[model samples]
Target chain A: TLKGKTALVTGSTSGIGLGIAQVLARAGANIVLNGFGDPAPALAEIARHGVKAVHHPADLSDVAQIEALFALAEREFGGVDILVNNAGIQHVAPVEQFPLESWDKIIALNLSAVFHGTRLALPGMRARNWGRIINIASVHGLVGSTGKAAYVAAKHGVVGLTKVVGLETATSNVTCNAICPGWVLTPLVQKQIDDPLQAQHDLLAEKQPSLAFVTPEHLGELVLFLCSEAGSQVRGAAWNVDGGWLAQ
Target chain B: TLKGKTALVTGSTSGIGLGIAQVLARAGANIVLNGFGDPAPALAEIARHGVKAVHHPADLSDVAQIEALFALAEREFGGVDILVNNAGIQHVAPVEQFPLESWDKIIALNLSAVFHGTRLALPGMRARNWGRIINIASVHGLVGSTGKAAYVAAKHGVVGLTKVVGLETATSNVTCNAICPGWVLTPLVQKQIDDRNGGDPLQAQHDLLAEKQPSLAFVTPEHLGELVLFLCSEAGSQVRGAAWNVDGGWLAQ
Candidate 1:
């Protein structure tokens, strides 16, 4: 049904974004993939799904880079019908000892990049009378942890931003929402998890009560759901697939 | 320990309320029970858990009954440390075809009663400097479904209320939150099974989820009871304004 739709997903070279790109591509959306890691593999994999795939390398922390990325989406595919603000960076430290630049970068890419992309994505979507904007927030978006002050604050902002955008578009067909997942096993997260497990058992035992990491594929299906008619009513929800992490 | 703490759980005569009352009683809180039915069984069970129990049949719809309900709790236990606003009713119909009386009754009991209880419950909690207010909202509170106009609206209102109260008490030890659950197999729902299927409860349960509930399982009342117990703990101190869902992947899709 998305045969003519185009999706621009940030950080799609690997992990969650790549999985989402693949799923949306299979649904017939041409993909404008962005991120690092030789774009060759992601490009080929997506092209195999029978949709046009292009890679744009942009350092999302810079507003100019973000503007350029949207420019590519506009030039290549007319515009992004589905814009996924899935790129984010995390830094963990106590509030008092946190590095200044780390906080700046986290807020820039994790929060401001979302605001920039969404502002640009909306005008085209409004003109088209249909659009989907999904932001990949973490469970920290909904709750707090001891060490993630910057990430938590930014993700919370993302959820709040989602609500305002959702309400603004409530009468239109454009919908914006955030997905909150706990302990996803992605390359970006492998930095934290490679040091986890209290050997192995204590990692999930500590917070992710489900004792299993949410797979990127599982998250992809949820992204696909939001793009479906069944999800037309799910506006501004920070839905978590954390395997009961927040239940306690 | 909650040795000196008292818990006032509305609708504690049975179902989710009885289950939560039993757990809190096990944790050493004196119990004040409300709602209809023979309270003897609930009272006896709380006693078995080594806690004092008293029942006050106050129809929560009437502001007078609500005031009296808290009054009895004050006379019996000094003040309520934990106020569980779990009493609610459900009505199913399209917005156009829904009955006005049923809509009014649901809003009165489900939404207004919670407000009445919270405003009355907060002052005592602030004086004590420690308290928990847990509202049993439904998954519908976070999302919506057809033929659930009144219930969904009320539950959403409850969740919004939880957020505001949570922020107001953020500086205090008092935490307010809501627990959203999917279909649980209460006696009333079990009747749905028997009425709809007439035999083979096991097969019928799956059929019930043939249309919804991805996990093909019902959330247990004890599951909810345990989460409420957790909200009363130190670990839950920072957990304010959360409408945490315990659905088996019902909202995931």
Candidate 2:
């Protein structure tokens, strides 16, 4: 569906990001996979679709690395036509006891990184008159949980940023949106769910009304639909694919 | 800042609607109040703010009545400079046992009435390059709860409509937003508390709300009024399609 498009998905080395990268590649777009960890499998996986797939490992917590990541994408494919700001980190603790460094790191990687990436992609997309900037926010973006102050705040900020970007580009071809998913079982989430803090783990499971974990592939399909022509009118919308979790 | 403006607040005969109407009037906006019951007190209260205040009791559940309310606003104040869609009715029941008519009335008054008022006011706002349409949604708009299927759906739909309208008017001076308030001690909620307590207990209801709201406090109508004022300010020009919450962190948890 996106034959000539160059798609860069942050944190694509594994988990939900990799899932989105795979689907976008399968739809014929070249992929730029980013994050920490071995990129061989993700690179090899996208190569199977017969499109250019490269790994650009960058510490998303650092602004310079984020700029460098975008530079690499521009050097490789002119500029990103589809920017998916999906890199994120999390920490769970009472607000008063939460470590300052943990809060800073989470905000840097999850929120500020998205800001940098979207600003970089906006100019090119505006010039081309066509682009999609999708921020992988969470159900936490719309609502909140007990011990996810930093994560919740960052996700909410991302949703707010999505609205600003959507408004700024409302008349143009560029569109910005946030996708709020509920309880996608990934390595990071698995760790959170298995944390020594049983209360935290229990609360995580109990919040999702479906009681069933959302698969990464489901999110991949949603991203695909958003990039399709039919999604052009969906501006500033934060859609939930959370198994009716938000519906209660 | 709103001196010359005229504001129309639905369900303004009492409670949150009356609170919002009074605040807007204090800010110098002519008030066009709508709802049931004695409007004399509401008009008097708003008039105390030294601004023109009138009542137009419209059955918001009826689309034609909603149109007539807007027409009255036009005739009274030329055109509504600010439109507050606060008129709503609620019925709680399990989805399987929920009354069909109850659902229709809730959707009509809560969701569709906002649509009617916005569409009617848009042309004038666009012509002038400025307007504010604030939808009084609830925390349920962001999340959900059992036994509130109709209210929840209608509130969520209002949020969605707010986004679409915000985008439609993004480049223009007109803006649309939803205020998702958590628990407030209004007559409507007071009735719920009274029913649960059989009348004569406030602490139990306060505790109940504090459990979910975290702040151990109910949001005030005056706070919401300040928020609406901010949204209408030049500083809030870019704050579009945003569902601003004044829930004492009810949604945060």
Candidate 3:
């Protein structure tokens, strides 16, 4: 369904972004990889699927770099089409003692970077009469956790902003929506696996009713489905990819 | 449990707002009425209950005036501890043909106005270490309805915005949330009974269900108000950032 389309997945150097990009590429899409990390391995992996690939490594926190990253996609590919704002970082701290510096950094990279990406890519898509902007929000976007104030707030904002952008183009071909995943096992989430202070092992296991954190490849399947033609009607939706996490 | 609290409901002169205000007042909270329409009848009806009833009518669609309405509640009967952002207006038309003005009106009154009321009233409650902000969003907030583009978008936005506000004040005494109600029978909804295009009333009722709500019946605002009072209790604090829908299984599928 996504054949002849070009998909840009931010933070695709590793983890969830890489997983999603790999799936999109396998289903016939030229992929652009973004993030401040090595892109050669991801490029080699995606190229095996017989689809074109490009790696535009950039710091998501830097607005200028983000703009260039999108611009480079259009320059390399014929023109830009699909965008998956899947780049995000995780930090753990209680509300009062949470580092303000980390809060600012998370908001800049995880939340604000999506906004900057969408604002730049939208007008071009609107001009062509087609586009898809998918934001990667977390389960923290739906409910609360004890010590993720900044992360929760940014994800919440991501959910809200996705609606505003979706409603703005509801009747148009440029659709925007968000995906809220719960307890996905990625490299970013790996660091929290064995922590003693936060009770990481038990807390992570109890986060979802499935008793196992979801793998990144599972998220890639959802991303592929959303990029299909049937997904055009699903505007402004925050479909949860948790194992009945919100239901509990 | 809500007997001693001062409950302030906006647009309480009629419809769902009036139903909620009456029920909460009956449960023992002092009532502060701020409906744009007539206040005399509701004022008299609420006062007969022997709870302190105060009228501070203000247009909720206007943002600046709402600040003063909150002030009147603070000055007259101590600060309002419970706020129901129940004021709303609806306009229906196809997405391609919907009026831009109607869209703005719905967003400001139905969505943004709730933000203003919650933001302005919450600080005092937080300072005193207690508050409940319940917004009345429709089932359209959870699902889409044709010919209600503006209304649906605004209500959905209301549900989305409520989560952020709820998270910000999560650990505090102030708890913010929204209630998603399906086709509730109110003055706002009674027009369907009279304005049906079908010849027979029964057919028209059936048609109303098929066209607007798939549930086959109208939900009463009184039931919604009861749910509101339940959420105001200590038992509901655990449910933050929730936009629970009493939709008669509209979303169950």
Top of the candidates by DockQ? 2
What would the per-residue lDDT of candidate 1 be over residues A1-248, giving only the tens digit for each residue?
77899999998999999988999988999999999768999998799988899989999999999999999989998999998999888888999999999999999999999999999999999999999999999888887776688999899999999999999998988999999998777866566556365533465665676688888888888998999898888888888988777654
**Worst ten-residue run, lDDT, model 3 chain B?**
B205-214
Name the runs in model 2 displaced over 4 angstroms. Answer: A1-90, A100-146, A149-206, A212-248, B124-130, B167-173, B194-203, B210-212, B237-241
Docking class of 2: acceptable
- Residue pairs with colliding backbones in model 3 are none
Candidate 1 local Cα displacement, residue A45, angstroms: 28
- Per prediction, the TM-score for chain B is 0.97, 0.94, 0.92
DockQ of candidate 2 (2 decimals): 0.45
Candidate scoring better on TM-score of 1 and 2: 2
CAPRI level of candidate 3: incorrect
What pairs collide in candidate 2? Answer: none
Candidate 2: count the clashes: 0
Error of 3 at A68 (Å): 1.5
Q: Which scores greater on lDDT, model 2 or model 3?
A: 2
Tell me each candidate's TM-score.
Answer: 0.58, 0.63, 0.53
**lDDT: worst 10-residue window of model 2 chain B:** B197-206
The C-alpha stretches of model 3 lying farther than 4 A from their native spots are A191-203, B1-253
DockQ metric for all predictions: 0.05, 0.45, 0.03
Clashes of each: 1, 0, 0
